[PDB]
C-alpha cells in the first residue's frame, strides 16, 4: 500500500519519465496528478494532458482510478475522461507500475481502437472520414490541450 506507492514514487524520482511527470497532490499519497505529452506522430502533438489517479485502499490488489482532465477527441475516451483500458477494469493484477500505465495510455493516444469503441460517433468518423477526424483532433488538442 503506502510502501509500494512510495517505492513507485521514488522510482519515478530517480528515473525521470521524460514524457510523463506524476506526483502526489499536495501531500496525499492516494491522489496523484500526472501529465502526458502528446506523441509527435499523432494529432495531439504539442499538447499537455492532465490525468487524476486515485489509488484504492487495497492497492496494488485493485486498479487505480485514472481519469482524464483535459478534453480530448479520442474514440476510446469519453467526455468524463474515462479510459477504455483493459488493465484498469478487470485485467488488473498486482504487478503493474504507474509508469507502465502511463506508457500504455501514451500508446493508446498513439493509435486508437475503433473496433471496440467507447464513443461510437468519434469511431464512426475515424473509420469513415479520416481527414475530418484529424482536423477535429487537432482543433481540440489546440483549444484545450494548450494553455
Amino acid at each position: 500500500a503506502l510502501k509500494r506507492i512510495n517505492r513507485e514514487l521514488a522510482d519515478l524520482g530517480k528515473d525521470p519519465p521524460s514524457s510523463s511527470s506524476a506526483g502526489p497532490v499536495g501531500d496525499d499519497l492516494f491522489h496523484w496528478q500526472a501529465t502526458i505529452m502528446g506523441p509527435a506522430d499523432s494529432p495531439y502533438a504539442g499538447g499537455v494532458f492532465f490525468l487524476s489517479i486515485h489509488f484504492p485502499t487495497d492497492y496494488p490488489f485493485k486498479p487505480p482510478k485514472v481519469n482524464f482532465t483535459t478534453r480530448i477527441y479520442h474514440p476510446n475516451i469519453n467526455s468524463n475522461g474515462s479510459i477504455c483500458l483493459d488493465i484498469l477494469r478487470d485485467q488488473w493484477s498486482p504487478a503493474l507500475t504507474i509508469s507502465k500505465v502511463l506508457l500504455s495510455i501514451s500508446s493508446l493516444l498513439t493509435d486508437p481502437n475503433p473496433d471496440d469503441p467507447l464513443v461510437p460517433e468519434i469511431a464512426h468518423v475515424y473509420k469513415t472520414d479520416r481527414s475530418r477526424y484529424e482536423l477535429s483532433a487537432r482543433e481540440w488538442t489546440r483549444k484545450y490541450a494548450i494553455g
Partner: protein, 985 residues
C-alpha cells in the same frame, strides 16, 4: 403463496420449489434439551409445515446449561410443555404442538423424525418402523465435547441436487462436426466428465436446440466433447449451453443393519482412526445407561471409567470389530458423559436441522450415514480438572462444570469481550455467551455495537427479534433478550449504536480497548473487518472472525504474537464489467441490470441533487462552471427539472415517461445502428456484430405489451414522487393519456469562440433566481430494495427487460433482478448456528491462554455437501532487523514525541538505518527526495505539530498515540522493512 418478505434470503439458497415442498412436511422431535431445542428452533425458522415435540421428563437445573427456553422458575415441569410456548413465537406459519404419549403407528403422521436423548433400544424400535414405511430418521447425540449424527432416509432416496451449485452455463464460439465444443476466448466452461448439457440459440446446427441432454467429455479448460453431431449438421456457430442435472438414487441402511457395518463421514483427515472408536464408545454409553437405571458415568470418575471400558471391550468383542481400543480416548468419552455445552449443541443442531431440510426438500447431498465429531482440543490445560472440581454444584452451569470445572468457570465469568455487529451471528454469539455464563462475575462485562435497525427480512435467521421489534435498534433488543435468557447478565451488557470506523475512535479509544479480553466480529463487509483487525493488532487483542455465505462458512482465530492477522490474506475481488460493455454492447442480463441501475440514479437522483444544491448554495453556478466535469449537463438538468419540464399533473408525468421510453429504447439504438450498421465490418474484415456484440433493434411503443406498461407506470410513479404528486395505478388513465401522443420526429445526425459559453450563459439567465424559490425542494429517490411499494425494483426490472428486448437477451423476473441489483447475500439459520458453535469452541481455547499454534483450528464447512475441515492457523512471518528477530505483524517501535530530526538520528544510531520515507495515515510527513528548503522548514518540528501542519487539522483531545509507517534503507543501500512506529503523545 410464499411470503418473500420474510424468506427473502432463504429463497436464494433453497428456491421456490424446495420451500414449496418443505411447507408440506411434518417434523417430529423427540427430546427437548439443548440439542433438541436448537433443532426445533432452526426447523421453525426454516418454514416446515409443523413441529411436534415429545419430552415428558421434568425439568432439572442442569438442563439450563444449554436450554435457553427454560428458566429457573420452570423446575419440575415437563420440558416440552414449557418449551412449546416459547417456540410457537419464532414463526407464525409453523404451528408447534406437544404429544403426551408416543405410539409407533402415530409415527406415520410425520415426514421426518428426529431422535435425541433416547436409549439405543428405543432407537432401534423406532427405526425398525420408520425404515420400512419410508420415513426419514435422524438421530443425534451430544456428550461433552463429542457428537454423533445418524441419517437414514430409506432405501430409495431421490436427490435432485447433489452439490447445491447453480447449473453451469456459457457462451460457445464454435462446435465442430465431431462434437468438439469450444468456449469464447479466455472463457472456461467448468464442466466435468459425465455431465449432461443442453444447447440453445445455436446457429448452423438447429438440431442441437431441441433440448435433448448430451454427454460431456472434457478435453481441456476451454474445449470439451459432446459426441457425434454428424446427422444434425457439419459446424455450429455461437450459441449458449446450459448444464442439465439428473436425479441421483441414494440407498440407506437401517440402524440395526448399520450398527454392524457403519459407513462413516470424516469431518477431519488428521484423525481418521477415531470414528471407529466413537462407534464403540457411544454404544457402550448406551449399555452403561441401561445397566445403571439411565445414569451416565459420573464426571471424572475412575471406577465408572473402568466399568465403561469393560463395556467397550465387551461390545468390540460382540460386534467382531478388529480394532484395538484406545483406552485414553475412550476413558475421555467416559469422563465427559454428563457434559452439556452450548457450542456443541449449536453446532450439532445446525447440522441436524440442515439434514432435516435435506430430507424434506430432497435437495443437497445428505450425510451417509454416521458422522462422529469431537473438539477435544478445547479441553483446558491451565486449570485443574478432577473429580473434586467437576462435581455438580447445583447451579445452571453444571452441564459445563462437568466438562471444564469450577476454576475455568471462574475464568469465564470474568471475561470482558467486545462484539462488533448484532446480525445473525451476533445474536447466536450473544446466546452462547449468555448460556456459558460469560461476564457474570464482578469484573465481567460485554459490549455490543451495531448501527442498523430491525427489518422484516431479518426475522428469518435472527431469533432474538420479534415482529413487534421491527424498526428498533438491533443492539438494544439483543441485549434485552439475552438479559431475559440469563438474568445474571443484568447490568453486565452495554449496547452502542455506533458504526465501528475512523469516526468512532472517540468512543472505542485506548481506554475502551485496553480493558477488553477479546474481540468478536459479526460484520458483513470487508472494510469494517480490516479496520477492526488493525485496531486489534495495534492493541494486541485476540480476534475471532466468522463469515457465512449461503450454506458455506468459515471461522478464523487471530492470536497476538502467534498467528497472522486477518488482512494478511486476500480474497477474490468483485467483478466490474467494462464501461464499453455496459454502455453500448451488453450480452448478459447483468449488464442490462447495471445499466438500468445507472439509468435510475441518473434520472431520479443526480438531477434532483443538482437542483437542490442550486437552490441552496448561493454560489453553486460559479463553482460548477469551473469544477464539474460537464457544467453544461448540470445547467441542462437544472433547467429541465425547474422550468422546461416541470410537471403540473400526473398526466404530464405519464407523457414524460413516454418521452423517456422513446429516448432510451428507440432513439439511442437508432443512433447506434447509424454509427455501426448491421452489415458493417471491422478493420480486419470480420463482421462488427459478431461474438460478444449483438445487433440491437429499436422498440416501438405498444401499450398492450406488459413490459412497456410496467416501465411507464414505474417511471411516472417515480417522477411523481420526485415532484410530490398523486400517483395512480388504474390502466384506464394511462391508456387514455398515451392514446393522444405524437412522437416528435427523430433522425440520426452525422455531426458535420465563446459562443457556446454565451449559450451556456443563456441557459444560466433563463433559470429562475434562487430567491424566487425559497423552501422549494425536490425529493430525491434513494434506492431501497427491501420495500416493494417504492417502484424501485419494478423500474429496474422493466428497464432491464426492455434493454434485453433491444439486444435479444433473455429477460429475468423481479426475483433475480432484486438479487442482482441489491447485492443480496444468501443467508441461512443453520450456517449461522454452525459458525457460532465453532467460534464458541475456539473461545474456550482463547480463554485458557493456549500458547502452541497447533492447538487452534481455523474451520471451513459446506453444508450442501456435508463437508467439514479444520486447519491450523498460519504463523506470523518473522524478519531479521539489525541482526535481531522481529515479528512482522505484532511488533512496533515505541518512541516519545520527539522532533523529526531526533527521530531520524535515533533510527540512524540505534537501528543503524537511514530513514527515507515517513508517513502518518495518508499524508507523507517526510521524504528523502524533498527539496532542502522544505526539509529545513520541517526538520525541527515535533511529530504532532508536523502532523497537524501537514494534515491541516488539529489533533483531537482524546488522541493518545500516532501510528507511523516508515521505510528505511540499510547502510549499504538495501531496502529493509521495519515495523511501524508508535509515537506516544
Amino acid at each position: 403463496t410464499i411470503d418473500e418478505g420474510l424468506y427473502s434470503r432463504q429463497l436464494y439458497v433453497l428456491g421456490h420449489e424446495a420451500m414449496k415442498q418443505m411447507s408440506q412436511s411434518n417434523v417430529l422431535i423427540i427430546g427437548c434439551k439443548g440439542l433438541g431445542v436448537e433443532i426445533a428452533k432452526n426447523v421453525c425458522l426454516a418454514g416446515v409445515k409443523s413441529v411436534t415435540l415429545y419430552d415428558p421428563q421434568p425439568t432439572r437445573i442442569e438442563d439450563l446449561s444449554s436450554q435457553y427456553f427454560l428458566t429457573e422458575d420452570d423446575i419440575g415441569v415437563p420440558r416440552a410443555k414449557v418449551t412449546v410456548s416459547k417456540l410457537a413465537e419464532l414463526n407464525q406459519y409453523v404451528p408447534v404442538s406437544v404429544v403426551d404419549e408416543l405410539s409407533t403407528e402415530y409415527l406415520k403422521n410425520f415426514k421426518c423424525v428426529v431422535v435425541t436423548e433416547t436409549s439405543l433400544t428405543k432407537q432401534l424400535e423406532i427405526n425398525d418402523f420408520t425404515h420400512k414405511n419410508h420415513i426419514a430418521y435422524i438421530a443425534a447425540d451430544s456428550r461433552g465435547l463429542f457428537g454423533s449424527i445418524f441419517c437414514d432416509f430409506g432405501e430409495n432416496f431421490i436427490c435432485t441436487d447433489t452439490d447445491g451449485n447453480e447449473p453451469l452455463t456459457g457462451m460457445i464460439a464454435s462446435i465442430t462436426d465431431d462434437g468438439v465444443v469450444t468456449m469464447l476466448e479466455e472463457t472456461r466452461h467448468g464442466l466435468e466428465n459425465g455431465d449432461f448439457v443442453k444447447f440453445t440459440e445455436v446457429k448452423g446446427m438447429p438440431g442441437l436446440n431441441d433440448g435433448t441432454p448430451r454427454k460431456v467429455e472434457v478435453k481441456g479448460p476451454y474445449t470439451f466433447s459432446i459426441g457425434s453431431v454428424k446427422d444434425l449438421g457439419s459446424a455450429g456457430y455461437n450459441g449458449v449451453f446450459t448444464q442439465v442435472k439428473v436425479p441421483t438414487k441414494i440407498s440407506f441402511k437401517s440402524l440395526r443393519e448399520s450398527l454392524k457395518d457403519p459407513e462413516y463421514v470424516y469431518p477431519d483427515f488428521g484423525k481418521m482412526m477415531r470414528p471407529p472408536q466413537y462407534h464403540i464408545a457411544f454404544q457402550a454409553l448406551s449399555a452403561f445407561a441401561d445397566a445403571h437405571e439411565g445414569s451416565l458415568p459420573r464426571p471424572r470418575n475412575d471406577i465408572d471409567a473402568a466399568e465403561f471400558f469393560e463395556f467397550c471391550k465387551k461390545i468390540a468383542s460382540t460386534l467382531q470389530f478388529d480394532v484395538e481400543l484406545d483406552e485414553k480416548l475412550i476413558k475421555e468419552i467416559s469422563y465427559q458423559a454428563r457434559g452439556d455445552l452450548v457450542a456443541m449443541s449449536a453446532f450439532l443442531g445446525g447440522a441436524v436441522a440442515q439434514e432435516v431440510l435435506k430430507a424434506t426438500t430432497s435437495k443437497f447431498y445428505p450425510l451417509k450415514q454416521y458422522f462422529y465429531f469431537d473438539s477435544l482440543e478445547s479441553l483446558p490445560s491451565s486449570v485443574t480438572i478432577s473429580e473434586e472440581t467437576c462435581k455438580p454444584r447445583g447451579c445452571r452451569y453444571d452441564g459445563q462444570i462437568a466438562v471444564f470445572g469450577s476454576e475455568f468457570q471462574e475464568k469465564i465469568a470474568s471475561l470482558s469481550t467486545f462484539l462488533v455487529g448484532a446480525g445473525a451471528i451476533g445474536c447466536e454469539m450473544l446466546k452462547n455467551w449468555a448460556m456459558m455464563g460469560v461476564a457474570t462475575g464482578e469484573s465481567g462485562h460485554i459490549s455490543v455495537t451495531d448501527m442498523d435497525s430491525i427489518e422484516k427480512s431479518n426475522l428469518n435467521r435472527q431469533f432474538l427479534f420479534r415482529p413487534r421489534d421491527v424498526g428498533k435498534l438491533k443492539s438494544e433488543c439483543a441485549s434485552t433478550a439475552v438479559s431475559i435468557m440469563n438474568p445474571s447478565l443484568t447490568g453486565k451488557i452495554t449496547s452502542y449504536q455506533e458504526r465501528v470506523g475512523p469516526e468512532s475512535e472517540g468512543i472505542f479509544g485506548d481506554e475502551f480497548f485496553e480493558k477488553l479480553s477479546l474481540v468478536t466480529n459479526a460484520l458483513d463487509n470487508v472494510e469494517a473487518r480490516m479496520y477492526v483487525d488493525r485496531r486489534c493488532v495495534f492493541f494486541e487483542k485476540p480476534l475471532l472472525e466468522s463469515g457465512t455465505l449461503g450454506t458455506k462458512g468459515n471461522t478464523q482465530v487471530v492470536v497476538p504474537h502467534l498467528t497472522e492477522s486477518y488482512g494478511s490474506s486476500q480474497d477474490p475481488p468483485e467483478k466490474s464489467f467494462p464501461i464499453c460493455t455496459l454502455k453500448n454492447f451488453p450480452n448478459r442480463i447483468e449488464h442490462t441490470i447495471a445499466w438500468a441501475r445507472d439509468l435510475f440514479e441518473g434520472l431520479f437522483k443526480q438531477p434532483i441533487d443538482n437542483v437542490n444544491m442550486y437552490l441552496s448554495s448561493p454560489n453553486f453556478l460559479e463553482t460548477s462552471l469551473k469544477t464539474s466535469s460537464n457544467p453544461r449537463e448540470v445547467l441542462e438538468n437544472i433547467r429541465d427539472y425547474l422550468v422546461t419540464e416541470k410537471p403540473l399533473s400526473f398526466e404530464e408525468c405519464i407523457m414524460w415517461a413516454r418521452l423517456q421510453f422513446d429516448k432510451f429504447f428507440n432513439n439511442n439504438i437508432q443512433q447506434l445502428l447509424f454509427n455501426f450498421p448491421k452489415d458493417s465490418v471491422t478493420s480486419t474484415g470480420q463482421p462488427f456484430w459478431s461474438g460478444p456484440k449483438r445487433a440491437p433493434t429499436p422498440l416501438s411503443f405498444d401499450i398492450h405489451n406488459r413490459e412497456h406498461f410496467d416501465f411507464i407506470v414505474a417511471a411516472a410513479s417515480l417522477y411523481a414522487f420526485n415532484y410530490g404528486l398523486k400517483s395512480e395505478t388504474d390502466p384506464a388513465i394511462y391508456e387514455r393519456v398515451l392514446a393522444g401522443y405524437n412522437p416528435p420526429p427523430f433522425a440520426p445526425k452525422s455531426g458535420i469562440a465563446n459562443k457556446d459559453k454565451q449559450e451556456l450563459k443563456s441557459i444560466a439567465d433563463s433559470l429562475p433566481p434562487p430567491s424566487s424559490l425559497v423552501g422549494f425542494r425536490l425529493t430525491p429517490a434513494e434506492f431501497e430494495k427491501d420495500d416493494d411499494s417504492n417502484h424501485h425494483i419494478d423500474f429496474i426490472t422493466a428497464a432491464s427487460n426492455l434493454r434485453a428486448m433491444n439486444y435479444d437477451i433473455t429477460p429475468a423476473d423481479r426475483f433475480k433482478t432484486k438479487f442482482v441489483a441489491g447485492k443480496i447475500v444468501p443467508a441461512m439459520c443453520t450456517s449461522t448456528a454452525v459458525v457460532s458453535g465453532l467460534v464458541c469452541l475456539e473461545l474456550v481455547k482463547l480463554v485458557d491462554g493456549k500458547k502452541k499454534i497447533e492447538e487452534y483450528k481455523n474451520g471451513f464447512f459446506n453444508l450442501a455437501i456435508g463437508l467439514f475441515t479444520f486447519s491450523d492457523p498460519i504463523a506470523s512471518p518473522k524478519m531479521k532487523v539489525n541482526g535481531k528477530e522481529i515479528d512482522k505483524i505484532w511488533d512496533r517501535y515505541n518512541l516519545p514525541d520527539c522532533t523529526l530530526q531526533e527521530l531520524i538520528d535515533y533510527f540512524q544510531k540505534e537501528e543503524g538505518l537511514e530513514v527515507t520515507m515517513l508517513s502518518s495515515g495518508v499524508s507523507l510527513l517526510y521524504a528523502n527526495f524533498q527539496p532542502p528548503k522544505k526539509l529545513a522548514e520541517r526538520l525541527p518540528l515535533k511529530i504532532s505539530e508536523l502532523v497537524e501542519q501537514i494534515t491541516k487539522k488539529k489533533l483531537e483531545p482524546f488522541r493518545k498515540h500516532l501510528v507511523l509507517e516508515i521505510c528505511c534503507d540499510d547502510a549499504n543501500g538495501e531496502d529493509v522493512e521495519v515495523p511501524f512506529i508508535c509515537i506516544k503523545l
